[PDB]
Subunit: 417 residues, 4 copies
């Protein structure tokens, strides 16, 4: 009754091949869609109306493509996103995608002006083009300046050198974009999928976010329904491990931007359920390093705990997003509802599959234990309204023990009433 749904029969299988044989097109997905959708802003997606429609449809991250358009053009894109968000809470992160050393018909002086404009306007993420080695990342971090230290740097792997030197690059980036457009020209088209699966693999091991990009629903630029290769490509990117999936032409210039967003939402939700966690969790667990970080250790005990009871959600209190990021690397079925006072952490955490941020805006309660419990209550009332939690559900609550500890090192099992 509960168990027919969200591919639970396939999830119980004892081998991967039996998992595949048990996938069922009548097992409806239950869980909130968790792979986040990045939408490139362009003429088709600049109106505030259009941007609200694309938020109801699932966009979590707006991409600004600095290959086209002036600073004033993009400042207007930024303005319409922020006005769409605050004319409804679903935060939307803003991502600056550097022109990079691009020819059209190292770090340039233009990229550096663009990165400074980005800090000026408070962007949350930089998609850094043509990262070929760790010093390219530093060049970017420098450019951002001490004022842009909270901005995440997702490094775009677009050519052979970046693929070769990937471990070094991942070791200094917050995350990765598999930038398949340039990559499929710079290395042979038939080899991209190997590079994609590898980098998503290595990123899932590292606990850092990975983005699949470019041409996933290409044909919806002119048609209202995608091709079968495209829906496959979305589904497989999620099955591969990706934290984010992206739309470029489909939302920037095409005729069906909202439908494009909706379609990635639909494919993503089905594929999330078809994930074979039992094998996935076991492989992450075996390969990941023993840890003496109380937050890592609470994270994995909390995720384990969530699977044993089919927890509806893990509610985590986080300030920077790190605690939710460590839950998310284990790919819980349960929603990671991350309550934070940082509105920029709330936006950035959309880079991590499965994290649903709540922005909490009350002044601190005099007694810290009362504050913690007030934020947790926020978490639960929100999750009830938004359909995450039903009375009678179990939830795992992850929090800290004392204030300014830096550690979210307490886990509690709890029944929604």
């Amino acid at each position: 009754a509960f168990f027919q749904q969200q591919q639970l029969p396939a999830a119980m299988a004892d081998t991967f091949l039996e998992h595949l044989c048990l996938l069922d097109i009548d097992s409806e997905p239950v869980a909130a869609r968790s792979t986040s959708i990045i939408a490139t802003i362009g003429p088709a997606s600049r109106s505030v109306e259009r941007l609200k429609e694309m938020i109801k449809a699932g966009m979590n991250i707006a991409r600004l493509n600095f290959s086209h358009g002036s600073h004033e053009y993009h400042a207007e894109s930024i303005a319409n996103v922020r006005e769409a968000v605050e004319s409804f809470y679903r935060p939307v992160a803003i991502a600056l995608d550097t022109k990079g050393p691009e020819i059209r018909t190292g770090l340039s002086e233009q990229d550096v002006r663009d990165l400074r404009f980005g800090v000026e306007h408070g962007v949350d993420i930089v998609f850094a083009s043509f990262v070929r080695k760790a010093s390219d990342v530093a060049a970017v971090r420098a450019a951002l300046g001490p004022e842009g230290h909270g901005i995440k740097i997702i490094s775009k792997i677009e050519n052979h050198e970046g693929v070769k030197r990937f471990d070094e690059i991942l070791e200094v980036s917050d995350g990765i974009m598999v930038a398949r457009g340039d990559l499929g020209i710079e290395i042979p088209a038939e080899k991209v999928f190997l590079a994609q699966k590898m980098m998503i693999g290595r990123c899932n091991l590292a606990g850092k976010p990975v983005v699949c990009a470019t041409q996933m629903l290409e044909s919806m630029i002119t048609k209202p329904r995608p091709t079968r290769a495209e829906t496959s490509d979305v589904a497989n990117a999620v099955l591969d491990g990706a934290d984010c999936i992206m739309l470029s032409g489909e939302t920037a210039k095409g005729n069906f931007p909202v439908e494009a967003v909706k379609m990635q939402h639909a494919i993503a939700r089905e594929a999330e359920a078809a994930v074979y966690h039992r094998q996935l969790f076991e492989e992450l667990r075996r390969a990941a390093p023993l840890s003496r970080d109380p937050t890592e250790v609470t994270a994995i005990g909390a995720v384990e705990a969530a699977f044993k009871c089919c927890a509806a959600a893990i509610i985590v209190l986080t300030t920077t997003g790190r605690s939710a990021q460590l839950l998310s690397r284990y790919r819980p079925r349960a929603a990671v509802i991350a309550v934070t006072r940082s509105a920029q952490a709330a936006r950035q955490v959309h880079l991590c599959r499965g994290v649903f941020p709540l922005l909490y805006r009350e002044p601190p309660e005099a007694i810290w234990a009362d504050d913690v419990d007030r934020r947790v209550q926020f978490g639960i009332e929100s999750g009830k309204l938004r359909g995450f939690l039903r009375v009678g559900d179990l939830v795992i609550v992850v929090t800290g023990h004392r204030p300014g500890s830096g550690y979210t090192n307490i886990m509690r099992v709890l029944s929604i009433s």
Copy 2:
């Protein structure tokens, strides 16, 4: 450090993925077969010769359009293109029926009888919903069509839900994602696909992935990034065949599309994680007291143990070659057969490389078996499958006529 071998030897799937390597060149023969649909862009003998060089293994006749005369021309054109290389590549001919409620319409029967009279090897039966639909097709093919393989197209919800029953009476399956993506929500078709290929793999029966794989190459000379993903993943799901429709029937780049599926297939096949796959297919498989099965599995175990360049199998109907292929050996299955139709039809099985043997039987049967093996070894050396000092497994029968393939021997080159 070629053939994705570091990643093949990972101790987990997660680590296999992390070790996939764009520099690790594939050197085995492409093993997943390429079905190309015939149409105005691919009909000419000159186009068909270009496709065969490119990798085409199975020519598809879409009877949703065109007269008996037009398909009879298509058939004669493929056969000429083939015989002009007698680099001999048998090419199967498959009749993809029109269909639509009757498992077969008035017209379908006429088409089926046309296809029997013109010697077609395969039928793709549209809108198969249940076992009785398969049986209708097989009655329509009547007595002279008993050797024709029936690959049921699953195109809607009933057919997915009644899948196991269709599979058990079909020779194989096509995941017909075009109609299926309309008959059920499009976001679900990867689930139906992954299921059916898994089940077909486990039952050892050939499965075809079809439709819109490289759709944009109909007008463009390079595919999208989704399309290369789709083909690579279909091979990773387990498909025996991948198909091309508009891309070769009407598009401006039929040859290039065949090429591109050739290139992707090869890379995906190297990325296969046999270690998990072989073990899972041997675990899930069932006990068998058929000597041909038993020999097949023992032979695939042996080939992995010694990184054999190939398994050479003497087969008359292709069965022993299919039973080898159901275990996805890394080693090429070189199938030596006197039956022209079996050399064509084994292209439904991943990794089977048919060699047609035309010599008059030797008086001494043990001499006839050995001459056919040497023919396999030489043709294998000639084509690049086998180097001196490779190891091959050989799979044959014990006695003339038994109808069984119960002997295997290990051999150097």
Copy 3:
């Protein structure tokens, strides 16, 4: 360094076969011995002085064999055990449970004598009953009715001694608190060459089910007359621990033999080596995989806590428990980490000795007005006792498992913690 010890090279092996091949006789076991030792009381072990040496050697449960000896004889045994235990009331206090092993016999499965013996055991406050010749779930129910209402906290461990009990095992286990593999009689009721199948089955299923299992009889038989056991006998003890047994037992070796203390010591030494050789990577995985989903917050906290302890090489899981249960649910995942169970119930501090790896600490301070002060205080008591006993070092990581609400019975909170 640290990773040469407690067969950690062998524990990190990626296969069982590789684990076996990396077992190292030089790799010293440094954890606390965790399989509990049942000693049968008899003329060789009855004296207070003899019992003190046995407690010191490792005895955790004293077994009263009511197949012989009068009520008065056993009342002396009990008083003697309790005196010896009281003699050590910190570093050396060791709760010791008292278990009553019934005399037993189509037959009724509770002789008229057994009822008198069980009423004796309740009157005298025994913690455990080992119930002979359990054939079916109604036999267990008979025993629970015989113990009457004062006896509701006594644990019932059903002895499986013949073919029928083996065959109705699941029915028995479901209503018992645990099991004893009673190999003596069982080796007569079924061909002796089959007993290891029964033993290995029953331990497996009790591990699965989270319930205690005792391997019993002739484990070190020759030490009755010899000061050293045979090579088969040390193997039997090691393998029973590797099979998954929570307790290992001594009968003639302690009741009538000439080397009762040495037999306890020897079961202590083997058990310690064997525990270190357990292949937890496979065993933890198979246990959670086969354990069903659960909506019991204490269950869920428990498995989350063992996962966490494994990930960080936790020196201990400290669990406040009133009844032993939250301790028992940590134990059923076989944590390499010691389970230190702080409790106010003297009876539960004794009874958790049925559970591998649980070290009870009896807490006697009066409640604190502030209930969260009382929790912190009991947790500290565990940390110090652990440091005073070698369980715990500065800088070790521990998992603390507690309740949130002074009144429910749930240990639904886990915290990760440094010793300082």
Copy 4:
């Protein structure tokens, strides 16, 4: 189906097909009668209690496969007489019985005279005492001389250095004895099981025979039934992987030598069925290196073959017993019936669990292929007569292709008619 209905409840097959080890144990069934031929060999030490030719025939009947002569005691004339009574018992019944000489050790001047005596009287195996390094084994190989090139050297590991230098000793030995008696004095008694499971595991992976020895049924020296610890000890030695189990005082001086042999046979038969091949065979397989030995490649394919069809036997033609050894390391559930023209090979193969030798004495047919087939029919008639085989069984036949190749490199699947 074609096989009986009883089939799948016998031989612990329900446990054998379980998906995990834990579930395998949980499905062991004391009513699953073992049907297969007991395959672990029984070594029985000859002494006053076991020197009668009567006694020895009963012991062979009970299951003894190897007679151990303990040169720590008794004169050469004493052992000559023992050797003589063993051989008369055999040839007053065909059951080969190997004869093994166990050196006094602490290489002495006395051991040298003993090994030369041993060559003179044609012994099949030497249990060499206190092997501490590979050189020790060479001294034994030397003492045997050129006239003893065929004798197997099974190296007794009796102290710490032997344990720690184990890999180099196993590298030059045909096999290993875990000599628990001295080992339990030289290292702490409570560590021997660690040495035993280690050494059996390394011998299982290395394809070489390993013997578990000493005090296995000790109390049967004076009692007609053994203790519960002793039965458990035999069972677990077989479950550990041992090829042979040994009896010392139980047969050499005790009052129940025939009962001791019988009880080891009974316990060994049960424990062989209770083996979890599914995991064992896969571990041996992904641990074992790749190979270019055709015989070895054929062995694993023939064993895999026999498991797929529940083959009743693997009939193998062998001249030295190597092809039978190589099948034996994969621990087939099917009996390995080894047909050989070498009487010394037939005796020595009792070192390998699961190998059942048949001595073939006919002269070679002029057409090898007829000789081969005739030998295979000898295996099949022999197998039938003793209850290995029945009409309707499948067997896997393993032979050579051309005579004198030195490789057994063909398998055939074959119905028994």
